[PDB]
Amino acid sequence: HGARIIYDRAFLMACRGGKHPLQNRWALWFFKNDKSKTWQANLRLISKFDTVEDFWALYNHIQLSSNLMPGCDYSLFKDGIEPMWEDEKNKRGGRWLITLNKQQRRSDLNRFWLETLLCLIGESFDDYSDDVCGAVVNVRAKGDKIAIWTTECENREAVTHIGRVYKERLGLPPKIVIGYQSHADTATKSGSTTKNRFVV
Amino acid sequence: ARIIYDRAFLMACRGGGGENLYFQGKHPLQNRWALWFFKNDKSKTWQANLRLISKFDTVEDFWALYNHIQLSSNLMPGCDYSLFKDGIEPMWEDEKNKRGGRWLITLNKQQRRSDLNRFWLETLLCLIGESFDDYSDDVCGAVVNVRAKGDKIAIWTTECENREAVTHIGRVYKERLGLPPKIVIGYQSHADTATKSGSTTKNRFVV
Ligand SMILES: O=C(O)C1(c2ccc(Cl)cc2)CCCC1
Ligand SMILES: O=C(O)C1(c2ccc(Cl)cc2)CCCC1
C-alpha cells in the first residue's frame, strides 16, 4: 500500500512453467550485427512485460531461438530508458561489470544472465532498486560481459549496496572482485582498461 | 468486503492534509492500478511509444500522480492515457480484454476545453472507487484518446456477454458523468471495433 513489489529467487522460479505483477515494466532489447550501420541504427526492441509470467514466456522464447537471431547483445531496461549511455537516465550513471573469460561462457554465462535479470525484475536491492536502469549482456569471441547499469555514479551508498547484493546473488567468492565504472570513463578510450570508481 | 469510495470522499483526500502516521494514514484501494501513456513520436515504433508511467494502490498516491500529470500536461494530439488494473495491458488483445468491449464517450473539438478534464477525472474516480459494486470486477480500465477531430473517453470491460454487468456499469457511468438522458452512450465489443466494415461499429448495448 505504497509498498514495493519485491520477489525473491525462489518465488520467481516457482512461477516458471492470475499473473504476478512486477514493480516496473521492462523492455528487452537486442542489437543486430550489421557493421555497415551504427549501434543506434542496429538497436531493436524485442518485447515489453510487467508480469513474472510474461518474463518467463519471453525468456524461454529467446533462450530457445537465440542461436538463430542475427547478433550477440541483449539488454533489459526499465520502460522508457534506452540501453544507450546518452539516455537522460544513463548519462550520469555507470555499471557493475562482470567479465567472463572463455571457460566461463560454457559454465557461467546462462546462469549469470538469469540471476541478473531476477535481481532486476524482483527489485532485489530494496529502495536502491530505483537507481537501477537495466542490464546488458555482450556475447564476444574474447570473453562475455554482463553488467547492471545504474542512474547516478556519485550515489556511493546506492551503488555499493547494489554491488554487494549482486555479487552475493551471483555466488561469487569474495576473492573475485567486481568493479563499477562510470559511463563517462568507459566512453573515453585511454588504453586497455577503464578506471573503477568502486569495487566490491 | 469491497473497498468502495464515493466521489465526495475521494475529493476530500485530495490536496494534502495529514502525515501518514504509522504508514496507516493513506486510504487503500481495492485494486492496484497502472497509468499508461502513448507518445505520438514517429521517430519510434508503437511498441516503443507505449509506456507504463506509474502504479499506485492508495487514494493519496492516485492524487499525487494525477496532480503531477495535470501540471506537466502536454495534451498532445495522438497521445493516449490509460488507467488499467495491475496486470492488464491497455490493448484489446490482452487476455482480460479480448472478450470484452468499451462504453464510449466521444467529444467534439470544442468540448476539449469544456468537458475533457472533468469527464476524464470522473471516469478515474469510478474506477479507483469501485463505483459499480460487484460489477466493478468486470472493469479492466479506461482510455482517453486526445485527437484533432475530437476526443474519446472509454471504460473497458472484460466480457461483452455479461449483459447485466455491462448494463449496470453503463448506467452508473452515465449518471456519474452527469449526461442528459438524450445523449446516448454505446457499448462496443472490441472484436467489432477491430473490424472495419464501413461507416460505424455495431453497439451491442446502449444507455
Ligand atoms: O541464451 C540466450 O539466448 C541468452 C539470452 C537469454 C534470455 C534472454 Cl531474455 C536474452 C538472452 C543468454 C545470454 C545472452 C543470450
Ligand atoms: O490534464 C491532463 O493532462 C489530462 C490527464 C490528467 C491526469 C492524468 Cl493521471 C492523465 C491525463 C486530462 C485528460 C487527459 C490529459
Author numbering:
A (entry chain B): 9 to 25, 35 to 217
B (entry chain A): 11 to 217
What does the paper say about this structure?
The eIF4F complex includes a core of eIF4E, eIF4G and eIF4A5,6. eIF4E recognises and binds the mRNA 5’cap, and recruits eIF4G to provide a scaffold function for the eIF4F complex, while eIF4A is an RNA helicase that is stimulated by binding to eIF4E and eIF4G8. Here we screen a fragment library against eIF4E and identify a ligand-binding site with previously unknown function.
Compound 2 bound in a similar region to 1 but caused elongation of the α1-helix and movement of the loop region (consisting of residues 80–86 between the α1-helix and β3-sheet) resulting in a larger more solvent exposed binding site. The affinity of this fragment was much weaker, Kd = 7400 µM with low ligand efficiency (LE 0.19), possibly related to the energetic penalty paid for inducing the change in protein conformation and/or inadequately filling the hydrophobic binding site.
